[PDB]
């Protein structure tokens, strides 16, 4: 080809023949049906063709991490494929929709504490699985937490990250949803596991109040409110344990926020874990495996 | 009955009124107002296998009788649950008794008189090849007259090591043996480790193995390193504590070997009649044959 996008530069990857029919956008995300057996899945599309060499090697690294992750409270990965300059990730469809919608469907009626806590413990178990492996999740949001047909909570897998840039996170938040921005990101400090904990706190607060903790009339004032750490208090009819946990997740200094392992060690949360994980999984993930930044 | 089983069991008409949770429940008989404890086990959501094993466990509980084991009164089944009725020990649990010292150490004679009673109870269970998954200070009680009783609920005919580890990561982890930490088989000597934890609590008013996380607790237990007992306790007692915390199960003494140590043996007569001594130590044989 006498050239001066060369042909044969499109990447092709596939692991199976299964074909999917597009039904609908749902957010990025597409609802599909398999032509094999009519089962529904969600596909996330990422453009690849306009990435550098480096960015493609990092996306490949991210997908391999997604592809190996398995936990009952994380959306289950099915396969991926590449064609036409995009990467596509296929995952299971959660028939109960996202928590964002579930919160709005209350139309102002507050959830019972036992429901808030049963959902919350599941989100914590998922996040433990991610954080134990030293993976950051950039997308702990009520729009990225889903319910299965039997009511099980699943954290969206898409959004995991091996490392995150603070300027880029801040920019993404101006453009998309800003409600989960941590103080440290607002001050251009490193994104860390406690920044995930802040976002977890935002989700918990949404579940307690049906509202975002940090809202304001402008992006710039939203940033100042987040740094000040001042939010409308949760209803006093919720237990002291729950109200106090909300306050701890919103500590201004990351190192004062509890780790997800520490949250799960609080008695009123710990006593629920047994409903959600098998003895084998409890033993393996709380006791027998070792996790470290050393390899 | 055109389509597209609940069992009922009782042994007496006696009715009980719920007073308070203490799934153990404090109840009063409507007959004479005497207090009892009832443990409720849900049965309707068990498999075939699990129900056959629960029934086997309750039959073992129901036939057990010893002055230092909480006395089984009766059981009944209704509404998809099994209920076990036992005596209420008015003095409460040893856990509370230990905390009530508010840092004041027990006299060695008091430690040993309690300890011998726990050992006699555990001998009775172990002689019959029964494991006890719940040798804990929260499951050892004092009667109104000060007699020590090991809680019966918690006996087991076999125990799964993964399940025991899981239960500990969720409930109390302070009694976990090194072998269970390494996911190796639960055995009689694992009960001996837990007996050692109770003895240590009685000697120091603290747990032998504490840590800032479940994961680090596991590492401390395997290392076998614990704060030494006060040197004002006898050499006999301090040396016994060390033997019960041997890392390898087979190096821990059997409960029969513990009862044979002179400073313990001389107390047995206060707690068992001659007939019971002869029967427990000399005459009734048990064997894994079958
Ligand atoms: C991973 C993911 N990203 C989205 N965007 S949606 C989505 C996803 C994944 C699994 N299941 C679902 N279920 C679902 C059902 C109904 C509605 C919505 N929703 O995002 O408004 C989501 N959605
Ligand atoms: C078998 C049993 N399981 C319980 N849980 S409590 C219990 C039991 C059995 C016999 N007697 C008692 N007495 C008692 C009295 C007072 C306080 C407590 N307590 O465990 O806080 C227990 N408790
Ligand atoms: Cl964490
Ligand atoms: Cl051994
Ligand atoms: Cl033994």
Residue numbers in the entry:
A (entry chain B): -20 to -17, -11 to 11, 17 to 284
B (entry chain A): -20 to -17, -7 to 10, 17 to 284
Structure paper excerpt:
Eleven NIMA-related protein kinases (NEKs) are expressed in humans. At the protein level, it has been shown that NEK1 stabilizes the complex between ATR (ATM and Rad3-related) and ATRIP (ATR interacting protein) through phosphorylation, priming this complex for Chk1 phosphorylation. In this work we report the structure of the human NEK1 kinase domain in its apo form and in complex with an ATP-mimetic inhibitor. Overall, our structural model of the kinase domain will help the design of NEK1-specific inhibitors as potential anticancer drugs and other Nek1 reported diseases.
